[PDB]
Design a protein around this ligand. Structure first.
Ligand SMILES: CN(C)C(=O)CNC(=O)/C=C/c1ccc(C(F)(F)F)cc1
Ligand SMILES: *[C@@H]1O[C@H](CO)[C@@H](O)[C@H](O)[C@H]1NC(C)=O
Lengths: 605, 29
């Protein structure tokens, strides 16, 4: 609809497409088997980002409360943009940057941002992989290292932290992070974190050495194993004392959380992380298919699987949350019972859940003075369920603690980390795809050098950038990318990708060119979303981000051993200078789309 | 350190694989 001049001779034609495959068999990587393509998409869309952030987002807000908006926007906003990314990659036969520049030179900024966003999300994920494989390396010892504390200085008690906090808390915060007091208090490159980060980058380079002719062989173990281990954890998780309590807790969603703006804001941003939309990987992966591949079927299958896996993962994360919560509740009562049995010298087994409160007052009447001198913890179980996990805490504290309770603790622990490592590595394949290819298509390195040279330079580059997440304050540093800053650019790109393919390339052209490939011209559902419904939701929700998430003071939970209520999150405001850091990483890609366009409209004229 | 020896073995095998693949690439040349 916008006044585009000479779009053709800048992109492939429809009559030429018949010679983009057999004629162009070389010069472009091609999926050996549709299976190999489907596993990559399944891996990429249903990896970390769909299986890591989702439960954390659901544990926060409300259990079932946050699930409703997510599944509304998953189809009303995610399915459209996923179909639009697959079809345009399959039609124009080029990667992200190439596709946007083909539609319009100014759109190059869209691909540039997509490359930066993909880089940053890989940098983030890699660290999570490094922590996963730290934990995976320690889980080959019958008594797992986070099931106890180091003896006191006089080998008497244990570290005040470990004593006042949990063994799992001490293994995470002290033995793994050696975390400092503040983001301001920068630490040192904890050598063992650096060493695991090196292992992470090393394995990823090995699996992505030679583009897609090395990752497609990897996704045979990397997109299957994670789903054949998450159905066993489901069974194990369901087979847990009090598991069915947390499961119901998840399906009991206060409706007043569904009527809060941030809840849905954290759902929309989450849609574009669940499906790796606006990283640009998907466009490239769909461009190596047959020109006559049914991409509508692929988008719907990927979306259904991606939607259904989100709920399957919150049913495994809650079974464990209700297991731990039930245990705490039981411990609270046991302790209470013991306290009253002590002093009063009640016969052991006399007082029980069945007769606590009546024997509280009874014994009170018998001897109030003594009963008065008796602390009594409050046990609720629902309050235990309501307890919200800290960032990354759920996987390295909640799950780790539950595993220790599980029999043959080392078997499960190992399996739990091998699942998280595999669905991380899978996710990283797409993340790396979306930074290698743009960098090839800028023609930045002399094209005599092989593909392996360029893939190692970015592995080492991002490896060197990842030293900041290896300091004492690194965890705080990593929790900044869990702020709105991370989602700021994604929303801009996704909207621009939709607007460019509908009001620049032309939806009419798109409808014809889609009809040429799959056979039929897309349904009314696809028309009503792409034209108005999809753009409106995306645009309105970014405006909401500007109004809620963006309009919030930056604060972060600090782990202060020397702090009143040490075993309690200390929420403090970020120092002003970290606004500079959020201005760049929210504003570099987001202003790249406008700011390369203006460059192309002041050089031409 | 058991964790440390596990780390060592894993990194060794991974670098061996990296070398094998760079060679596979040399063969492809
Ligand atoms: C801080 N943040 C933004 C996060 O996203 C943290 N995510 C987590 O801590 C994720 C845990 C997690 C544990 C178990 C499973 C299972 F179900 F696979 F077992 C999945 C996810
Ligand atoms: C952790 O950090 C402190 C300084 O922040 C340092 O003295 C110590 O050697 C480090 N290692 C630990 C606690 O294992």
């Amino acid at each position: 609809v916008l006044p585009n001049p000479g779009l053709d001779a800048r992109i492939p034609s429809l009559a030429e497409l018949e010679t983009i495959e057999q004629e162009e068999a070389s010069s472009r990587p091609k999926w050996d088997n549709k299976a190999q393509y489907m596993l990559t998409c399944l891996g990429f869309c249903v990896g970390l980002g769909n299986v890591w952030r989702f439960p954390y987002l659901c544990q926060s807000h409300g259990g079932g409360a946050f699930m409703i908006p997510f599944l509304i926007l998953l189809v009303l906003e995610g399915i459209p943009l996923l179909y639009l990314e697959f079809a345009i990659g399959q039609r124009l036969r080029r990667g992200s940057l190439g596709v946007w520049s083909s539609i319009h030179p100014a759109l190059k900024g869209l691909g540039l941002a997509s490359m930066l966003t993909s880089f940053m999300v890989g940098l983030y994920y890699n660290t999570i992989i490094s922590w996963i494989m730290w934990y995976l390396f320690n889980s080959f010892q019958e008594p797992l290292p986070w099931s106890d504390c180091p003896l006191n200085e006089n080998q008497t008690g244990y570290v005040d932290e470990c004593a006042r906090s949990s063994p799992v808390d001490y293994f995470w915060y002290r033995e793994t992070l050696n975390i400092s007091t503040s983001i301001s208090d920068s630490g040192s490159i904890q050598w063992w974190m650096l060493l695991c980060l090196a292992c992470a980058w090393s394995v990823l380079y090995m699996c992505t050495i030679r583009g897609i002719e090395t990752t497609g062989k990897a996704v045979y173990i990397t997109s299957t194993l994670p789903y054949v281990v998450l159905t066993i954890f489901l069974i194990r998780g369901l087979t847990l004392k009090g598991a069915t309590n947390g499961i119901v807790f998840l399906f009991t969603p206060n409706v007043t959380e569904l009527a809060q703006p941030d809840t849905w804001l954290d759902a929309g941003a989450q849609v574009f992380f669940s499906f790796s939309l606006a990283f640009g990987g998907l466009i490239s992966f769909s461009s190596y298919n047959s020109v006559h591949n049914n991409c509508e079927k692929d988008s719907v299958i990927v979306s259904i699987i991606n939607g259904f896996t989100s709920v399957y993962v919150a049913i495994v994360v809650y079974s464990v949350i209700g297991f731990r919560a039930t245990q705490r509740y039981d411990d609270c009562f046991s302790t209470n019972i013991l306290t009253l049995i002590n002093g009063f010298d009640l016969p052991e087994g006399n007082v029980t859940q069945e007769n606590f409160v009546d024997m509280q007052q009874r014994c009170n009447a018998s001897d109030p003075a003594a009963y008065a001198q008796l602390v009594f913890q409050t046990c609720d179980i629902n309050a235990f369920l309501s307890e919200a996990v800290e960032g990354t805490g759920l996987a390295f504290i909640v799950f780790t603690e539950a595993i220790t309770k599980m029999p043959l603790s080392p078997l499960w622990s190992v399996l739990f980390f091998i699942m998280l490592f595999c669905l991380g590595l899978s996710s990283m394949f797409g993340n790396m795809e979306g930074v290698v290819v743009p960098l090839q298509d800028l023609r930045v390195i002399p094209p005599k050098w092989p593909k392996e040279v360029l893939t190692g330079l970015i592995c080492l580059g991002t490896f060197l950038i990842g030293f900041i997440f290896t300091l004492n304050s690194g965890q705080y540093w990593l929790s900044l990318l869990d702020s709105y800053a991370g989602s700021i650019p994604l929303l801009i790109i996704a909207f621009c990708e939709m607007f460019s393919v509908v009001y620049v390339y032309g939806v009419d052209r798109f409808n014809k060119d889609i009809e040429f490939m799959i056979g039929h011209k897309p349904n009314i559902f696809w028309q009503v979303t792409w034209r108005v419904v999809s753009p409106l939701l995306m645009l309105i929700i970014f405006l909401f981000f500007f109004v809620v998430e963006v309009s919030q003071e930056l604060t972060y939970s600090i782990w202060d051993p020397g702090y009143e209520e040490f075993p309690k999150s200390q929420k403090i405001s970020y120092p002003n200078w970290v606004y500079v850091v959020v201005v760049i990483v929210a504003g570099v890609p987001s202003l790249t789309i406008p700011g390369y366009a203006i460059y192309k409209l002041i050089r031409n004229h | 350190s058991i964790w440390l020896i596990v780390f060592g073995v894993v990194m060794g095998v991974i670098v061996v694989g990296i070398v094998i693949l760079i060679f596979t690439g040399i063969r492809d040349r």
